[PDB]
Specification:
Chain A: This is Caspase-4 subunit p20. The complex is a heterotrimer of chains A (about 160), B (about 200) and C (about 90). With about 160 residues, chain A is an alpha/beta fold. Chain A has a single domain (about 15-135), classed as Rossmann fold (3-Layer(aba) Sandwich), CATH 3.40.50.1460. Chain A is built from three helices and six strands. Chain A has a four-stranded parallel beta sheet with strand order 2-1-3-6, sandwiched between helices. A two-stranded antiparallel ribbon of chain A has the order 4-5. In chain A, helix 2 runs parallel beside helix 3 (about 110-115). Chain B is mostly helical. Helix content of chain B is about 60%, strand content about 5%. Chain B has nine helices and three strands. Chain B has helices spanning about 5-15, 20-35, 40-55, 65-70, 80-95, 100-110, 115-130, 155-160, 180-195; strands at about 135-140, 165, 175. A three-stranded antiparallel beta sheet of chain B has the order 1-3-2, covered by helices on one side. The longest helix of chain B is centred in the N-terminal third of the chain and has 17 residues, at about 40-55. The radius of gyration of chain B is 17 Å and the shape is elongated. Chain C is an alpha+beta fold. Chain C has one domain (about 1-90): Caspase-like (Alpha-Beta Plaits, 2-Layer Sandwich), CATH 3.30.70.1470. A two-stranded antiparallel sheet of chain C has the order 1-4. In chain C, strand 2 and strand 3 form a beta hairpin. At the A-C interface, helix 1, helix 3 and strand 6 of A face strand 1, strand 2, strand 3 and helix 1 of C.
Chain lengths: ~160, ~200, ~90
């Protein structure tokens, strides 16, 4: 009882989850197949008992207003947790809005999301799990490289002599 | 074709090498300097890499420094890594265009950062002599000619052996269009060699 | 009545990759991170808690590919195990 988060019965439960996904950008490449992520995540969260709110094609101020709107929902009082799915282009410290460009930034910092949903600004979700899923790049560099392999064949993973 | 197509082609080949481990790029660079005094080893490595890139099958290992280079371009299962073998194959073809003296000089020159300075001189010669099809003269900045600029300077011999007429006084380089193919190869060579010591 | 509480607690973030690096997405099926996250959820939500699901997703990306990603767990302020109890 003390090691797990308490789960409310599915009776008078109003679990809410939020999906924010941007597909078309004025200066950034179109995120082809983003609808597959939206439909997949929304269906999974529905199977988990969450009523999914989906908002698409938003600016950084649009994302901020919708997140504050989502956090002020009275349904969280009769909920036990929430999910936050964010899918767009991304920078190192933030997620990109529709109008984002290197000259004209339109970025919502991930730190802003924690401020919106913490115990200070979101009373409905106090002591309740807040899960954030971020499908976005965090840079422009490749995440792989080539290195050496043990000269020894597959027979000897670990062997003495 | 122009110099811009040459740069993009060589830069793209050097781009895939940036993902190689630092020790492996140094092993390739040192062992290239070793086989640079051994033309049969360069010819054998070209054939092995060319056969492996075309067929996609196992590459028969080679001995000596040529094999040390091949270790850095193959998987455990024996196939070539196309992203890694192709730029090395491109470098070997450019070195094969060079003369034996130019190859021997490059073997001595990989050990330093003077290689970087030498690259931009050849680049400047190709840009300043454009249009390539006309004989022309090129003036060089004194900051690039080193402390002693004469026929005993190693950079002098590298450019002179490409078929360029050199002199001490400005203009120092006489561009002969018959030198285009070897000079370009030297540029491509100096580029890929410099990108490995980075 | 007045009670004391933390400002930030009970958070967990699951990023699709490590900082400074790219996250990949298939034009025909969506993002690789999102797809396996759903698959690992439907396969293990009945018996594993939230962290274990995330850890199994990260394990699915362990073997390096030509376009590799390593999903990262970040800013985790969870104090207990998060079991969802699907279907109840």
């Amino acid at each position: 009882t003390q090691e797990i988060y308490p789960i409310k019965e599915a009776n008078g439960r109003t679990r809410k989850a939020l999906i924010i996904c941007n597909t078309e950008f004025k200066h950034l490449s179109l995120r082809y197949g983003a609808n597959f992520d939206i439909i997949g995540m929304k269906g999974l969260l529905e199977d988990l008992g969450y009523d999914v709110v989906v908002k698409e094609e938003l600016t950084a101020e649009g994302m901020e207003s919708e997140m504050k709107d989502f956090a002020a929902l009275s349904e969280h009082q009769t909920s036990d947790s929430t999910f936050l799915v964010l899918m767009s282009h991304g920078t190192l410290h933030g997620i990109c809005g529709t109008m984002h460009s290197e000259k004209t930034p339109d970025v919502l910092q991930y730190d802003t999301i924690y401020q919106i949903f913490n115990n200070c600004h979101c009373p409905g979700l106090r002591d309740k799990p807040k899960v954030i899923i971020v499908q976005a790049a965090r840079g422009g560099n490749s995440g792989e490289m080539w290195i050496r392999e043990s000269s020894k064949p597959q027979l000897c993973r670990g062997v003495d002599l | 074709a122009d110099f811009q197509g040459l740069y993009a082609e060589v830069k793209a080949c050097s781009s895939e090498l940036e993902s190689l481990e630092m020790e492996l790029r140094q092993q390739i660079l040192v062992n290239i300097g070793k086989i640079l005094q051994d033309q049969p080893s360069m010819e054998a490595l070209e054939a092995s890499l060319g056969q492996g890139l075309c067929s996609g099958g196992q590459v028969e290992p080679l001995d000596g420094p040529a094999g040390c280079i091949l270790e850095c371009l193959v998987l455990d299962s024996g196939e070539l890594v196309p992203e890694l073998a192709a730029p090395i194959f491109y470098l070997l073809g450019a070195l094969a265009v060079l003369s034996e003296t130019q190859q021997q000089l490059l073997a001595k020159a990989l050990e330093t950062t003077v290689l970087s300075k030498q690259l931009e001189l050849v680049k400047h010669v190709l840009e300043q002599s454009t249009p390539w099809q006309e004989q022309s003269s090129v003036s060089l900045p004194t900051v690039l000619l080193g402390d002693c600029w004469d026929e005993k300077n190693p950079t002098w011999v590298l450019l002179e052996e490409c078929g360029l007429r050199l002199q001490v006084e400005s203009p120092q380089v006489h561009w002969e269009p018959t030198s285009l193919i070897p000079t370009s190869a030297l540029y491509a060579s100096l580029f890929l060699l410099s990108s490995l010591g980075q | 009545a007045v009670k004391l509480s933390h400002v930030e607690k009970d958070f967990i973030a699951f990023y699709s990759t490590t900082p400074h690096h790219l996250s990949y997405r298939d034009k025909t099926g969506g993002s690789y991170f999102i797809t396996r996250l759903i698959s690992c959820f439907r396969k293990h939500a009945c018996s594993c808690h939230l962290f274990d699901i995330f850890l199994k997703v990260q394990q699915s990306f362990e073997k390096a590919s030509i376009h590799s990603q390593m999903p990262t767990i970040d800013r985790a302020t969870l104090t207990r195990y998060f079991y969802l109890f699907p279907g109840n």
